[PDB]
Design a protein around this nucleic acid. Sequence first.
RNA 1: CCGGUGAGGCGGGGGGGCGCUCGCUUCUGGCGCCAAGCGCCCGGCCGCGCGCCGGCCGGGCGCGACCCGCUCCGGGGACAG
Lengths: 49, 119, 241, 67
Amino acid sequence: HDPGRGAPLAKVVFRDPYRFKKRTELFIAAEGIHTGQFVYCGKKAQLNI
Amino acid sequence: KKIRTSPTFRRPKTLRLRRQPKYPRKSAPRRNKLDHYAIIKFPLTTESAMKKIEDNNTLVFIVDVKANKHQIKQAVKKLYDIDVAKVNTLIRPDGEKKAYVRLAPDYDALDVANKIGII
Amino acid sequence: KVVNPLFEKRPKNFGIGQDIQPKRDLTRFVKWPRYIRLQRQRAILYKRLKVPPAINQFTQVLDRQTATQLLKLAHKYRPETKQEKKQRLLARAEKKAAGKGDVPTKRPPVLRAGVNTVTTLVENKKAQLVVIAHDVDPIELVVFLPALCRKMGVPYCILKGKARLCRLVHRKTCTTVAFTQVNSEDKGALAKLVEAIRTNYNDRYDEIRRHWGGNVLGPKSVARIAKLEKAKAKELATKLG
Amino acid sequence: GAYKYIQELWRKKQSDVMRFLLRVRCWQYRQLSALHRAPRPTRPDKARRLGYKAKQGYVIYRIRVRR
RNA sequence: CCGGUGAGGCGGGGGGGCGCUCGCUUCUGGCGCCAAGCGCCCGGCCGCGCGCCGGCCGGGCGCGACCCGCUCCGGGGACAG
């Protein structure tokens, strides 16, 4: 929960495909998003919430 | 053929030489103004100091404000040919530094106090 | 056997979502310091912009085979350097009254270095061959000079590198070099060199004046416009013909 | 000498050669800092006329000012 | 002039092939780096001895991880300013 913002945020952890490290981003959570869920991003990503 | 592994260009480390002056900035080094005689001003002969010397087996001196406890210990050792257990210092509400010099059990504070002249 | 069965292969799939990418060459994607980017972008601009023929003339430089012969001739007439002027002066001083030394003897022919000196002896029709560097940092130093050489009938050539031209003299750089006079041994070689030089610069100066140079787009834009032109041709390339 | 030719060239600023050179120089200078040391005089003839001499101890600086 | 980045794979070419297509990853709150393999060389020790032969120890280079390029990628643009 972000103070001053009604919409909740979601922390998503990726892996950088250049260095051995785990990147973390703070997206805006959409309806139906739950913890322990795989979310994809890219041109070939499927059409899911 | 040296490949740029990273996309960042940082400043290379160049050789830096150590200073080798042609002449010294000043002709001679400054003589120390905190010698073993300047640090110790005079022993304290107050009634409280007298009782401290007689009972706690310590010595009370008036010391320069710039002196450290190691300097006080070494100065007392060099001056009075004594070995010090510990030194407790304080700043009096007049600008002078007061130090309690605890003497080792081998030596007696009363004897050295008689030798230096205070009693 | 010489092969241990424990020796496996373990290949790496360098794809998307697989193990991390290898440390490839990234010279194209380096955030270079501002001066490197500036010195590359000024060359890019010189390629893009319509360079006037006065500056574009120095892009036409003498070829390697003629340049090496020119340097071979120039090395013979190098000016006196340090440690040699003093030796000559001492030789003349010790011979002041030793062998009846009047010292009128001779000054051997030498090269000419400065722009001022070369221009002065070109306006007087004293020079026979003039060599001009192409990479002077202010181009304004040598713009008029090819036109002046053509007007005065003095053959001129453009040589690669001001440092290379200035290595003939004993300094870092030199703008131009002029052959005021050469020894009788090398007069035929000089004549051949000036004959080869003046058939590329002096007699074609009108073309050089009319020859603008530039307006060359980058390979990305050129490739894009070529793709568009090929598509436009394909619109009517097999349907009609 | 070449200095007379350089001065006469610099008097014809409206010409294509001079305007091209001035535009390139202006872009290069605009890509630099507002005050930095220039190693050599861009206009040797003008510097000589103003009193500059090619000797050690003579320094020039390029300064950018808002119009 | 604006945005992103640790300015990390931009544009062309034929290499690669399951079939234009991609740098090959979508049933799950796992792991993933600092190369394996191949090939060409160098130095020291030892035996054959004709030694770029073999055994041990320690290293170098290339493919693996395609080639060439001129703006880092994009978005505006003779206009915003």
